Amino acid sequence: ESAWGPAATIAARQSATGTKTDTPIQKVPQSISVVTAEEMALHQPKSVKEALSYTPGVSVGTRGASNTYDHLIIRGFAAEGQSQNNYLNGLKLQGNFYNDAVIDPYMLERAEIMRGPVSVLYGKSSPGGLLNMVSKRPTTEPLKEVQFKAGTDSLFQTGFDFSDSLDDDGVYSYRLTGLARSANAQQKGSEEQRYAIAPAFTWRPDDKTNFTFLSYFQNEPETGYYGWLPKEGTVEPLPNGKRLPTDFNEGAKNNTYSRNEKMVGYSFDHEFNDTFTVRQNLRFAENKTSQNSVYGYGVCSDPANAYSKQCAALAPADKGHYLARKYVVDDEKLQNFSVDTQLQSKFATGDIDHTLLTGVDFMRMRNDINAWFGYDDSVPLLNLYNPSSHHHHHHGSSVNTDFDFNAKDPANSGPYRILNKQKQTGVYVQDQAQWDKVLVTLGGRYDWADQESLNRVAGTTDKRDDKQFTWRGGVNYLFDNGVTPYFSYSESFEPSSQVGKDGNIFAPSKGKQYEVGVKYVPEDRPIVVTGAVYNLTKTNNLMADPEGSFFSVEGGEIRARGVEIEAKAALSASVNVVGSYTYTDAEYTTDTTYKGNTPAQVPKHMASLWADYTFFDGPLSGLTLGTGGRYTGSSYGDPANSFKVGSYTVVDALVRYDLARVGMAGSNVALHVNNLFDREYVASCFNTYGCFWGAERQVVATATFRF
């Protein structure tokens, strides 16, 4: 098993996103999870987001039923500005504003998650949090796969995955993966459209040299729903005592959202001799996205709408059941270049073996934003009264009316046009020195993160050049019966894009984490079990001005201490089990307005358990039956901890049948169901006017053939 390849079992022993060198999990001084292709091909996730429903320390409901972005909250933290923090092949997919890229899981070999500070190897990043996806590479043996999906809400997906060798020596091999997916969003009027293709080329001139070309091209005409719903009508009842239905949509009938992705790059490694090996990863991508979206703000009786004219002009007792809305028109285009070059030197020092990693990482991102935002009264109000029993059960919500978007009244709307530039360069050194059973991992990295923002309207230009250093040290007492105790200190840094009162760009916030735990990686049985307890602190978090002044102020602090236990196994040739528990104590340590309060959208308790049985026996030979559930404790729906989103428990099921009994061994047909008990829940609220209905039970039938 290679950190950059398949795992054979639901349990991956090898990973390289934690130390940038192919290391076995037990030897990694940090909480690392790995969701293999197998596991993913088990639930047929819609996005890498869903593919993470069972991993501990990651909420995936930050946006409810919506999938526009694989935005995650890890260990109670996320990137600033609703941005993502996702890596693809050890390189970051640096996004900006609404321009953030996604990779379809069907194109991944595995999706890894690294918890806690990760700057020691990746540069600027949101504390405690990082997702690293691995492109599918050319396979060792022929692969001619064709897959067909069909599910609820008009879901239709047709995709292929072919990999072969051009020569009988395997010096030349490829892999072409693509898919065409179409579906209706949970919210009436909204659609989901995707076309993706990933071309890979691997050149192995010998057994010590590999250069694999990695490209990805994707087109999405419409990305689906991405709107906000009030706590009143979702979490809490509306005055009349009813609630907006889970399929309710508050946007224009002509709301539109598109994203365009294009990328070329490569992964290269070369072993010069018994001590020196070099590997370099490079990628270039130009990404576009645009939208015409009318989103809802809060109900008229919501503080946010305090200054709303359309709202104020209502009977004081009606403000509580009328929805106020705004809108945005956006169109962006960004390019991002990335290359990481590293050198791995293997040498000893009498009983002390060394694995020295030293490399230089570079990246630049440019994004051009040309958009328009509607402010108060920019769009008609909405009477939430209508959504009743005719809109619930019998049929459902109804699409509203069109909106202008064009003719932006200089009154209720204005222009937004920015040119954001980002540059980062870092050099790092790490060493995994094993002195028999005692593995010590230590290393660090220095960074040159420079940003430059141009406001095409104000004709302004804000700049900032950061120079940050981070290191990480850890110890793993490699036992022999499997158990592996480990502890480690880690650091991170995340620059700010916000400008203070002094007209200058804020300084970067920082992450510090203390984690200790044990990992059981038995060498005989294919089972992995890890548990960990940590104390992660984000510092210099921006907070309200002590003297309220529109401008924020740095110096705030947030602490997240919690426990995480995960377990994936192969208890049998017919038994597989995935399970995890997550305890999260996230609290505002220092903050002008909030404090003691816990950040919104982050539950205290989380747990998930899953298992599947397979048959090779009786009449049910080739049958795989699996079910499971995911637990999401209660959470706060706003910074003020004003209200709370209730806990919920969703169940997933799986019936898989091997088609061997039709001469099609290898292939198979399966039925997947998410939220079996079609539970109605509110995933979360980032504020009183920003709540998201969870996903209504979905059902998918999949036919995946192997020629």
Side-chain angles (χ1 to χ4, degrees), residues 15 18-19 23-30 32 472 476 486 519:
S15 164
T19 63
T23 286
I25 45 181
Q26 64 255 54
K27 297 183 177 176
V28 175
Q30 228 173 310
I32 274 62
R472 176 195 53 171
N476 284 73
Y486 80 84
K519 301 173 175 184

Side-chain angles (χ1 to χ4, degrees), residues 228-234 236 296-308 311-312 314 316 318-326 376 384 637-638 642-643 685-691:
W228 300 349
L229 280 198
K231 79 180 196 317
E232 301 90 321
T234 53
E236 303 169 351
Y297 231 51
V299 291
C300 277
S301 66
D302 195 296
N305 305 298
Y307 301 107
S308 167
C311 273
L314 293 175
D318 294 45
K319 303 171 179 295
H321 72 69
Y322 268 110
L323 181 71
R325 302 137 85 201
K326 303 189 176 191
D376 290 307
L384 308 186
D638 65 8
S642 165
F643 62 120
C685 304
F686 73 85
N687 207 316
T688 66
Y689 48 80
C691 295

Side-chain angles (χ1 to χ4, degrees), residues 479-598:
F479 254 45
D480 45 41
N481 54 310
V483 307
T484 308
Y486 80 84
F487 78 87
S488 69
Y489 169 81
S490 191
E491 320 194 308
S492 78
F493 83 95
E494 180 178 32
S496 182
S497 55
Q498 298 312 295
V499 55
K501 184 174 183 176
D502 63 312
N504 259 180
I505 301 292
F506 288 115
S509 83
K510 299 186 186 188
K512 310 295 179 179
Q513 172 192 292
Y514 289 112
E515 182 185 297
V516 315
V518 304
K519 301 173 175 184
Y520 178 62
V521 185
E523 177 49 56
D524 36 295
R525 329 158 189 174
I527 67 174
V528 184
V529 163
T530 175
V533 55
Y534 67 85
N535 181 274
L536 174 57
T537 305
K538 179 188 186 188
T539 54
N540 190 53
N541 185 49
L542 297 179
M543 64 193 146
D545 187 352
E547 37 238 54
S549 69
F550 279 44
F551 290 114
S552 294
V553 174
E554 51 195 74
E557 177 173 306
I558 300 183
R559 177 202 71 196
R561 52 175 166 60
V563 183
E564 328 182 319
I565 68 174
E566 176 173 59
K568 302 180 181 292
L571 308 181
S572 172
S574 62
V575 174
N576 286 169
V577 295
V578 168
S580 79
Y581 171 70
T582 305
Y583 179 63
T584 316
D585 177 87
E587 190 194 306
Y588 277 105
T589 292
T590 304
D591 189 286
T592 303
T593 303
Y594 322 106
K595 175 178 166 62
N597 287 51
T598 66

Side-chain angles (χ1 to χ4, degrees), residues 450-503:
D450 317 327
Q451 57 187 304
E452 185 177 295
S453 179
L454 163 73
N455 193 312
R456 291 196 191 303
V457 168
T460 63
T461 296
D462 300 285
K463 286 179 301 179
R464 173 117 187 182
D465 296 358
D466 272 292
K467 290 200 291 177
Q468 212 67 204
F469 170 80
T470 41
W471 67 284
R472 176 195 53 171
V475 187
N476 284 73
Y477 195 92
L478 193 57
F479 254 45
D480 45 41
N481 54 310
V483 307
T484 308
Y486 80 84
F487 78 87
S488 69
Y489 169 81
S490 191
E491 320 194 308
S492 78
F493 83 95
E494 180 178 32
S496 182
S497 55
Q498 298 312 295
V499 55
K501 184 174 183 176
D502 63 312

Side-chain angles (χ1 to χ4, degrees), residues 147-196:
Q147 194 172 62
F148 296 114
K149 287 177 182 298
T152 313
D153 297 304
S154 286
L155 163 57
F156 295 116
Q157 188 191 308
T158 180
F160 62 98
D161 192 3
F162 306 137
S163 185
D164 215 305
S165 308
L166 297 179
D167 66 297
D168 309 321
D169 280 297
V171 64
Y172 299 127
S173 57
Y174 68 98
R175 185 154 196 173
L176 194 54
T177 307
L179 68 81
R181 168 236 183 62
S182 179
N184 286 173
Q186 174 165 310
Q187 356 279 157
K188 286 237 62 175
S190 285
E191 311 166 298
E192 280 165 35
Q193 295 186 58
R194 175 183 288 171
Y195 303 118

Side-chain angles (χ1 to χ4, degrees), residues 336-529:
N336 177 184
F337 179 71
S338 302
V339 301
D340 183 47
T341 301
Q342 52 190 68
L343 181 69
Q344 186 181 295
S345 310
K346 305 298 282 291
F347 55 67
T349 301
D351 296 311
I352 301 180
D353 298 294
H354 295 190
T355 309
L356 174 65
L357 184 57
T358 65
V360 304
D361 178 23
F362 177 69
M363 79 78 41
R364 65 167 281 267
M365 180 282 300
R366 183 210 210 68
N367 182 50
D368 206 285
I369 310 166
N370 184 192
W372 202 285
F373 291 88
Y375 319 132
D376 290 307
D377 313 297
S378 68
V379 34
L381 300 177
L382 279 188
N383 192 326
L384 308 186
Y385 188 76
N386 214 62
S388 60
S389 184
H390 175 56
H391 281 311
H392 266 69
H393 271 160
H394 309 190
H395 274 295
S397 176
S398 185
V399 59
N400 300 310
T401 78
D402 303 314
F403 180 79
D404 203 303
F405 289 118
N406 291 290
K408 355 286 184 57
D409 195 322
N412 55 195
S413 53
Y416 188 66
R417 302 199 309 149
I418 315 299
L419 181 73
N420 286 145
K421 289 186 174 186
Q422 264 177 49
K423 236 176 187 185
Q424 172 162 285
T425 288
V427 294
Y428 51 104
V429 165
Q430 164 182 287
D431 186 64
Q432 287 159 295
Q434 196 184 322
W435 187 47
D436 298 297
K437 287 66 281 305
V438 166
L439 173 61
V440 59
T441 314
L442 175 66
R445 161 175 175 161
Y446 191 73
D447 276 290
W448 283 290
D450 317 327
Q451 57 187 304
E452 185 177 295
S453 179
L454 163 73
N455 193 312
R456 291 196 191 303
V457 168
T460 63
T461 296
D462 300 285
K463 286 179 301 179
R464 173 117 187 182
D465 296 358
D466 272 292
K467 290 200 291 177
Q468 212 67 204
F469 170 80
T470 41
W471 67 284
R472 176 195 53 171
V475 187
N476 284 73
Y477 195 92
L478 193 57
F479 254 45
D480 45 41
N481 54 310
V483 307
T484 308
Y486 80 84
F487 78 87
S488 69
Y489 169 81
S490 191
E491 320 194 308
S492 78
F493 83 95
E494 180 178 32
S496 182
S497 55
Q498 298 312 295
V499 55
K501 184 174 183 176
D502 63 312
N504 259 180
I505 301 292
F506 288 115
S509 83
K510 299 186 186 188
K512 310 295 179 179
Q513 172 192 292
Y514 289 112
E515 182 185 297
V516 315
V518 304
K519 301 173 175 184
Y520 178 62
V521 185
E523 177 49 56
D524 36 295
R525 329 158 189 174
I527 67 174
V528 184
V529 163

Side-chain angles (χ1 to χ4, degrees), residues 602-647:
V602 49
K604 207 165 186 299
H605 298 297
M606 280 192 288
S608 55
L609 183 73
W610 199 83
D612 48 304
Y613 192 81
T614 305
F615 293 113
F616 312 80
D617 303 57
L620 302 180
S621 188
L623 176 74
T624 306
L625 298 182
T627 180
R630 311 181 298 256
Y631 186 63
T632 307
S634 62
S635 70
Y636 289 88
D638 65 8
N641 284 176
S642 165
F643 62 120
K644 292 187 67 173
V645 180
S647 67

Side-chain angles (χ1 to χ4, degrees), residues 47-62:
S47 69
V48 168
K49 214 205 297 61
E50 276 105 301
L52 299 172
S53 299
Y54 292 78
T55 25
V58 186
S59 109
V60 302
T62 291

